[PDB]
Structure formats: structure tokens, C-alpha cells
Amino acid sequence: ESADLRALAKHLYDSYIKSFPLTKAKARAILTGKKSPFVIYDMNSLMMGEDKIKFKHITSKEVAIRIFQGCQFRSVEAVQEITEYAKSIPGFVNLDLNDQVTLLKYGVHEIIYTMLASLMNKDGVLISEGQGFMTREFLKSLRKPFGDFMEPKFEFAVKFNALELDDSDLAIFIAVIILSGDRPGLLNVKPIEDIQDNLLQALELQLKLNHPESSQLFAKLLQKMTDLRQIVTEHVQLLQVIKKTETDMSLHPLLQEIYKDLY
Amino acid sequence: HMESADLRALAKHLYDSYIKSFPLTKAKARAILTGKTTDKSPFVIYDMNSLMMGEDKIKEVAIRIFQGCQFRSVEAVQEITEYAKSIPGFVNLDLNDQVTLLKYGVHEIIYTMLASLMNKDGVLISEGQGFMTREFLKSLRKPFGDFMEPKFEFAVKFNALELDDSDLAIFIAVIILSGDRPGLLNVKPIEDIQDNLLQALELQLKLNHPESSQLFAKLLQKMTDLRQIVTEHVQLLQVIKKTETDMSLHPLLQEIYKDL
């Protein structure tokens, strides 16, 4: 069944390439300088970059709020990209429909953090499919709670990126996250865990073949699900403080509805 | 990286030292819990009166039971510390990192090993001479009842894996040698030891549970559940402190909780 695991790994890689706009491979070529992105490093260059490149989401007039809501808007797009990718995981569309919704509902946050790291290095983050690069220092220096809402994402990404996974690795890793049998309210846990057992076998063989000199990389990656659960839990607490504190966060009620599951 | 023979040799070393370090093994706890023996039968505490009868056979009740947990947890810290010293490479580490590893690891290990003493109906106490029912613990007043029950909810899930002591000896050792603890000075020598321990755990689980697919991964996934439940525990215990002055913690636990 070694061949079946390789076929499963290739199936997921192919679908991961079609589902997501900017791959890690393309993102790293930009970040290392190997088509030069527009750089946002302070207030003036943000103004010029939105007026020349037109990063979509500009509809509150305060910069720190507007960037915060830009993160929320792009996360909404990623949820749909993740949902389409999930449909391509063998067995997923055969699950009970409520369980498919539950798995996506409780998984998207962990997957967004994971895939955000592909776009980050220690100095900043690629935006608009890599047309722009917004610096870490600019994000971290935004006022009041917003600066400290940004920085934990880089702190995780820098640690996660030290594993040096590529797209073929991440495609299986993301699928493993989705097929988590311990999500609250699942109705039929067994077929979810059966599929996850398949994905874990495929991820294990993938990492051994793709990183034969990286001892226990499989274990180290699974240990990163501890970082993922903990930071998603921190994330929820930070959002709640911003909601109860900030009276300048009003969008059209329709927009608020679109965003309901990330605010 | 390592040998089949060295990995097996390391598993036997850790199992042997685990038996020497911890008084009440899972194997003994299971024999007591399943019964069918006359000589090892526990006295069962399920209400106020049987607790009273239990003091003559083996100051407010919820406080008294909480202090029972705290006392055994301090003893467990001592036992865990002795076991850790036996893990090859551990005492050779920087001494500050040794403190750091134990500081952040004991709580996760206490939860793990507490599960060995539990089934869905209660927990063995006083070296297996007693059994205190889950329903009795959960019905303790004010915050204490809901402080007891989460330990049972984890244990029922963890016990479904059917680990035995020889498995747990390596699992506990992997937890201790976690290179991502806050404030570690030399992460590299810790990670080198853990990789060895992880190779040892992988082979142990493959040989001892050959029909249990991806038990290795499922067990590492439980190290994640442990991280979250320890955080809730610390968080709830702090709230309980601000209400209850009828209890201080033992200075060993007190220091471990300083900065969580």
C-alpha cells in the first residue's frame, strides 16, 4: 500500500496547487528576492500602495482598524479556498453533511495560521497574491491592541518555518488537520478517524522520502498542532477584547454578517 | 538514527526505572479496579458518611479532599523528578534547563499518570486501598466539584488508547524532554534526547500494539490535549485561590505555579 499512499500524496498536492492562489514555493522566491513587490513599511507607503496597486478591502478611517479588517476580509476568502480543497480529500464528501460543516468550522483557524506562515518570514508578509510585502515592524507598531494582535502570528510563523516544509508536505498536513475526530458535536467520528489514519500514513511516508535526513520530522510536525491549538485559543481571547473595547469597528451590517465567524 | 537493539535497550531501561520510581503502576491499578480478587479490594468512598468510615479503615470536606489531591500531586512531583534523573542525558543538561523542563512538564505528567488510576466511575486513592467515586467528587460544593470532573473527562479518553506501563514510561520521558518549553537556554541538546526517545516510543508502540494503526500519532495528538487541560487547570486553580483562604499550596507546587 506504499503506492496508494504516494497516490494519495500526489492527489492532495495537485488539488492544493489548484485551490490556493499563492503557493509556498512561489512565496519563498519572492521573499528571498529570486516582479518586485510593493513594500508597505509606514503610513505614507500604505497610502501610495493602496492608491497605485489597489489592495482590495478598502470601504472607519483609522489605519490600524483598516489593516485589522483587511486580515479578516482575506481570512474569509481563505475559508472558501480551504472548503474547496477539503472537497478533494478522498472520503470527505461522503461524510455526513453536518460533520463536513463541523470539521470545516473548527479547522479553518488552524489551517489559516498554518498557511499564513508560508507567506511570512521574520521581516514581513506577502499580500495580494505576492504583489505586496507589508513589514513586520509596521504591523507590530500599530497602536493599542492591534500591534500586539499582529506580532504573535509572526512569532508562530518563524518557528513553524524552521521545519522547512514544502507544498507537497503541507497539502497532507492541512488534510490531517481537517479530519480531526475530536471536534465538538461530530456525529460519526469513526469514518473521520479512518480517513485521518490514512492521511497520517501518507504524511509519514511523504516526510521520510522528502526529508530523509530530518529525524522524527513527522513527530515534530504533529507536535506543532500544540502550537496551533494554543495560538487559536489565544486568538479568540484577543478578538473578544477588541470587540468589547473598540467603538470604531462598525461596518455595514451585511459586511458584519459576512465576517461573523472571524470576529 | 538508532539501532533496533539500542532502542529496545532504552525502552527496557526506562520501564525498569519507571517501576522503581512510581509506587502504584497502571498494572496494579487495573488489577485493583477490575477486582475478581479478594485480597486487593478497596474501600469505596461515595458520600459523607463513608468518607468518615474511611478515615478509621485506611477542615471542610471539599477543602479536605482538595488537600488530598495537592498532597499526592506534591509526592508525584517528587516521584517524577526522580524518574527524570534516570532519563539518559537529562542530568547532563544545563541545570537551569533541568528546572525548566520539570517545571513545565510535571503537570502534564500528573494528568497522564492520574488516568492510570481512574475508570469512568472513580479514582484509586491511598496507594490503591481506597476508591473515591466520580459522582461524589463532582458533587462537591462551589468551585471544587467542577475542578475534579475535567480530570475524569481526560482520563476516559486517554484510557481508550489502552497503553500499558512500558508504553507510558517512554511517553512520559518524551513529554519531559520538550524543547519548546519557555526559557530554555540550550534547545538543541534537549531535542537530540527527545528524538531518541521518540524513536524508542515508535518502535515500542509498533511491537506492543501491532494492530493499533498510527497509535504513535494518536498518542502525540494526546500531548496536545494535555497542553490545553493543564492551562485550564492552572487558570481555574488561580480563581479558586482568590476565594479560598483555607488553603495554601505546598511550596514546591507554589513555585511551579509562579509564572504558570
Ligand SMILES: O=C(O)c1ccc(-c2nn(C(=O)c3c(Cl)cccc3C(F)(F)F)c3ccc(Cl)cc23)c(OCC2CCOCC2)c1
Ligand atoms: O493570504 C493569506 O492566506 C492570508 C491568511 C491570513 C491572513 C491573516 N489572518 N490574520 C488573522 O488575524 C486571522 C488568522 Cl491568522 C486566522 C483566522 C482568522 C484571522 C482573522 F482574525 F483575521 F480573521 C492575520 C493577522 C496578522 C497578519 Cl500579518 C495576517 C493575518 C492574511 O492577512 C492578509 C492581510 C495582512 C495585512 O494586510 C492586508 C492583507 C492573509
Ligand SMILES: O=C(O)c1ccc(-c2nn(C(=O)c3c(Cl)cccc3C(F)(F)F)c3ccc(Cl)cc23)c(OCC2CCOCC2)c1
Ligand atoms: O496518586 C496520584 O498520583 C494522584 C495524582 C493527582 C491527584 C489529583 N491532583 N488533582 C489536582 O487538582 C492537581 C493535579 Cl491533577 C496536578 C497538579 C496539581 C493538582 C492540585 F491542584 F491538586 F494541586 C486532582 C483533581 C481531581 C482528582 Cl480526582 C485527582 C487529582 C490525585 O488525587 C488524590 C486523591 C486524594 C483523595 O481524594 C481524591 C483525589 C492523586
